Amino acid sequence: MGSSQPRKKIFKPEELRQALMPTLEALYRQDPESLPFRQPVDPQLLGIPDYFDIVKNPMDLSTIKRKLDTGQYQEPWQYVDDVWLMFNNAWLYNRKTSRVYKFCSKLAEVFEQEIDPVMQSLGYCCGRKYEFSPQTDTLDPEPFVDCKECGRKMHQICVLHYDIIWPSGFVCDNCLKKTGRPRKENKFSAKRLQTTRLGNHLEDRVNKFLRRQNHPEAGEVFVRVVASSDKTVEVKPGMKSRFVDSGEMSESFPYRTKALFAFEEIDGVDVCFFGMHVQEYGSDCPPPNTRRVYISYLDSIHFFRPRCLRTAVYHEILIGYLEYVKKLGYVTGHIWACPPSEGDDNIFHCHPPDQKIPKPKRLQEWYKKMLDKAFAERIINDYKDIFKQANEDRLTSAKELPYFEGDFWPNVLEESIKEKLYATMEKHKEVFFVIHLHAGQPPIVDPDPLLSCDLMDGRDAFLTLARDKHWEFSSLRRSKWSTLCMLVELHTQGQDRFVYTCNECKHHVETRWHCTVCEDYDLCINHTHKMVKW
Ligand SMILES: CC(=O)N[C@H](CCCCNC(=O)CSCCNC(=O)CCNC(=O)[C@H](O)C(C)(C)COP(=O)(O)OP(=O)(O)OC[C@H]1O[C@@H](n2cnc3c(N)ncnc32)[C@H](O)[C@@H]1OP(=O)(O)O)C(N)=O
Ligand SMILES: [Zn+2]
Ligand SMILES: [Zn+2]
Ligand SMILES: [Zn+2]
Ligand SMILES: [Zn+2]
Ligand SMILES: [Zn+2]
């Protein structure tokens, strides 16, 4: 039952009383807001019988003062926890409209204002009591990591320590500077993730843009394709009995799905801010889907450091994609511009509450804004809504409009099972976009291999994992931890197991040479660049 920290930091009652008293004093200094808290709550004075059936562990400034004065706190966190218990009791019994609730919120704002730097000066991260967002009476706490050398407990998310990266345990920032050796660099980074021709093109597109701007807060951006696989869309049994039972359209359609993410350095750490799953139907795919792409899902977390260039870099990513698929041989883009349902996430588990979900018109206008700039850039020849293309290119049969996986139309055709379908086309005409890469020969060849990654094969896997692991994207601090964890998941959970080969030799070798300039220059001496003995 007993533990052993020989060099553990203990605070004498007067050392913590010296440091924690200013913070408690600042609360008492707030008149009249601290007045219903300066003494314990009295249900007989207030006519509130049910108080002790709601608040089970009462707390108030006076009890916290008595504990502080008579040294009943051994380490700061017991003080910190008791104030938040008093605050949490007020937010509980008193309604959000209440004066006491507002009074409590003011005290809490001043507690946050003072407690953070005092805890920081005493070798801690912050003085806040954190909890995870509710899922599905009782909430989940934030994890803590105890310093190996000093024993000081810290919020795991504050300090960004994950064991799988640093297995020698966690040692606090100041302990490392007492020895004179800085922390061991995180190798599970976005920059280190497997480079792909597509991702490189997209990150060049955004890095050249912000290089031209030279914005102060702007951090380096990394776009990586984390999963790439060959999937198949099977035609639904309804439309299958009308066109597949004959020979008008194929029973299935081949596409390559690719999940891809965008990351940026914020305070020297990787923060993920953009997600996107696409469907690419190649040259050997039967009609209608031949040579077309389809943005299946897209998501974002608004913590992009220079908040001004935020939508400029989202648009530059979306435009770099179209410049890429077009260049290698695709002809039409397809976006179902629909926002997510209330309280539902596309890719990133827990969105920030202060992050505004655009209205369907705003989303259409945002996509519209992106496409016009790409037209001027001479990437997209032209674009039109689904109705202005089914009547310009003359469509009369169901088999003529593209059939994508999880798209609206493949499921709406199944609804017309008892019977007007061209009438549904102009109702939602602004939602569906048809992009033209070419106006009007050799087959497509994706140079990139296939990234096998179960977590990014479909949105559901990453969304469910983060939900169980509590990897939220609700705060910048919480997004930094969720990115830290998702990067180790993509690294360690790497389903692809490599077999390296040399370039000029073309042999499967174990001992090799790798220069510090090219992307993957492996060579067998059995070139101008300086090689490394790997
Ligand atoms: C059956 C079924 O399940 N069916 C489903 C159907 C799924 C359909 C398939 N979906 C797709 O294919 C994807 S199309 C896009 C989907 N939506 C999303 O990506 C999620 C929303 N979040 C975002 O990623 C971003 O908002 C983004 C779209 C990237 C635009 O970035 P932004 O930078 O432009 O921000 P803003 O929020 O638009 O607005 C930018 C400004 O507008 C402000 N703003 C935004 N919305 C509002 C608003 N509501 N009220 C007031 N202001 C508002 C915001 O505060 C801000 O201001 P500031 O510049 O001062 O900061 C199924 N199959 O699963
Ligand atoms: Zn903390
Ligand atoms: Zn320490
Ligand atoms: Zn700006
Ligand atoms: Zn060789
Ligand atoms: Zn080289």
The CATH architecture of the domain made up of 499-534 is: 2-Layer Sandwich (3.30)
Q: Supply the DSSP string of 223-274, one letter for each residue.
A: EEEEEEEEEEEEPPHHHIIIIITTTSS-SEEEEEEEEEEEEEEETTEEEEEE
Q: Matching CATH topology for 13-129 and 499-534?
A: no
The neighbour count for residue 532, using CB atoms within 10 Å, is 11
DSSP state of 504: S
- The residue among 320, 321, 264 whose CA lies nearest residue 294 is 321
Domain-by-domain residue ranges, the chain? 13-129, 146-179, 197-461, 499-534
Q: What is the number of the ligand closest to the CA of 336?
A: 1
The neighbour count for residue 35, using CB atoms within 10 Å, is 12
Rg (CA), the chain: 29
CA distance 235 to 250: 8
Pairing of strands 292-300, 269-281: antiparallel
State which of 279, 302, 362 you would mutate to test the pocket of ligand 1, scoring each by most atoms of that ligand within 8 A of its C-beta.
362
Q: What is the resolution of this structure in A?
A: 3.0
* Residue 200 tokens, joined: 């490189």
Pairing of strands 140-141, 144-146: unpaired
What stretches of 377-475 show up as alpha helix (H) in DSSP? 387-390, 408-415, 421-427, 460-469
Classify 472 as helix, strand or coil: coil
The neighbour count for residue 169, using CB atoms within 10 Å, is 12
Residue with tokens 């660099």: 185
- The residue among 415, 393, 262 whose CA lies nearest residue 332 is 393
The full 3-state SS of 306-360, as one line of letters, equals CCCCHHHHHHHHHHHHHHHHHHHCCCEEEEECCCCCCCCCCCCCCCCCCCCCCCH
Q: State which ligand 1 atom lies nearest to the alpha carbon of 355.
A: 55
CA distance 284 to 204: 30
List ligand 1's pocket residues with C-beta within 6 A: 295, 297-300, 310-311, 314, 336-340, 346, 356-359, 362-363, 366, 406
CA distance 286 to 305: 44
Classify 169 as helix, strand or coil: coil
Q: What is the number of the ligand closest to the CA of 347?
A: 1
CA distance 47 to 56: 17
Nearest CA to ligand 1 atom 1: 408
Strands (E), 118-251: 131-132, 140-141, 144-146, 153-155, 221-234
How far does the centroid of ligand 5 lie from the alpha carbon of residue 521, in Å? 10
Residue with tokens 């510090």: 516
Classify 239 as helix, strand or coil: helix
Distance of CA 426 to the CA centre of its chain: 35
Contacting residues for 368 by C-beta, under 8 A, at least 6 apart = none
Q: Using omega within 30 degrees of 0 as the cis cutoff, is the peptide bond preceding 32 cis?
A: yes
The neighbour count for residue 267, using CB atoms within 10 Å, is 11
- The residue among 198, 240, 220, 473 whose CA lies nearest residue 349 is 473
The neighbour count for residue 269, using CB atoms within 10 Å, is 19
- Backbone phi, then psi, for 232, in 5-degree steps? -140, 125
CA distance 117 to 102: 24
Method: X-ray
Question: After which residues is the backbone of the chain broken at C–N > 2.5 Å?
Answer: 136, 419, 440, 526
CA distance 380 to 371: 8
Hey, what CATH topology would domain 13-129 get?
Histone Acetyltransferase; Chain A (1.20.920)
Helices (H) and strands (E) in the chain, counts: 17, 14
Nearest CA to ligand 1 atom 27: 300
Could you tell me if 283 and 290 are in contact, meaning their C-beta atoms sit under 8 angstroms apart? yes
